[PDB]
Amino acid sequence: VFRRFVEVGRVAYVSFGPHAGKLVAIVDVIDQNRALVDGPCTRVRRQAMPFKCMQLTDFILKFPHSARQKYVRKAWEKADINTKWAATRWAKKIEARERKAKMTDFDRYKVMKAKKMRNRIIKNEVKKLQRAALLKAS
């Protein structure tokens, strides 16, 4: 039950390769397994790129199938995609992933202490709730 379709104008997130972590629009189709791609505002050159590597989102900035890079830059700024991106939850769990790699040892210790406490509180409240449901039953 397909929801996202490869349509000229659709935005894709680059999984791996040289241009990792970058957003980019599908300009055109060559064949079954190879497409013309360009992302002017994110510092990615006009180039070929196979569908294998990419994984498409639910945004479709509108432009003609052969439109030269000018009209794309204007349409991109016009829609203001980058901000809606940063609003998406996706990017947030990406930044979390990265902060977790960046995790310092001192922060790691402060975090362990925070966990320890937050979980003792939860344990207390949950046990009172279970006795409460028994009280409700009784």
Binding site: F5, I30, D31, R46, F51
Partner: protein, 176 residues
């Protein structure tokens, strides 16, 4: 000739050297697809040898240059004419591929001829390469792509980085 990596296109010209009979022989140009100027010069000599009274020793090569793609970001539909040797017999072809560059296309031809006919690279001679317009394109695999509102999904998505866990709990999904 092994077609390693991806070909270039080279503009070779050459001639027979002067003689007392004829002081200024005519120049001859070709369009060699080849990885480098060394194998280019060799193949040039083979074709000239097939057509004209001319060897490498009796002559000299005047100029070998690389020739760039003058329109590399436009997409094109190339039309190739062939000449191949079967196990038994020889046969002419006309084949249409859909690529951006002459070199990328010629590569794709080599790989297709290899798949579909087990034709080894040495047997094959390239005789004409013409960029051809969508109107004049005959083959339906090409013809189907000329449509403004092309649309298709990615249905079954085989996983890559299979071994990076090698051992998980959750069975992997492939539907998004």
């Amino acid at each position: 000739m092994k077609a390693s990596g991806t070909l270039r296109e080279y503009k070779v010209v050459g001639r027979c050297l002067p003689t007392p009979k004829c002081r200024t022989p005519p120049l001859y140009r070709m369009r060699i697809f080849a990885p480098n100027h060394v194998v280019a010069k060799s193949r040039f000599w083979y074709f000239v040898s097939q057509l004209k009274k001319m060897k490498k020793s009796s002559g000299e090569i005047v100029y070998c240059g690389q020739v760039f793609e003058k329109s590399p970001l436009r997409v094109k539909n190339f039309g190739i004419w062939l000449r191949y040797d079967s196990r038994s017999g020889t046969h002419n072809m006309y084949r249409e591929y859909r690529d951006l560059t002459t070199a990328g296309a010629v590569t794709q031809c080599y790989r297709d001829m290899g798949a579909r006919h087990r034709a080894r690279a040495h047997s094959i001679q390239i005789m004409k390469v013409e960029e051809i317009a969508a109107s004049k394109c005959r083959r339906p695999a090409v013809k189907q792509f000329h449509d403004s509102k092309i649309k298709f999904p990615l249905p079954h998505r085989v996983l890559r980085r299979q071994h990076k866990p090698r051992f998980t709990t959750k069975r992997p999904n492939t539907f998004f």
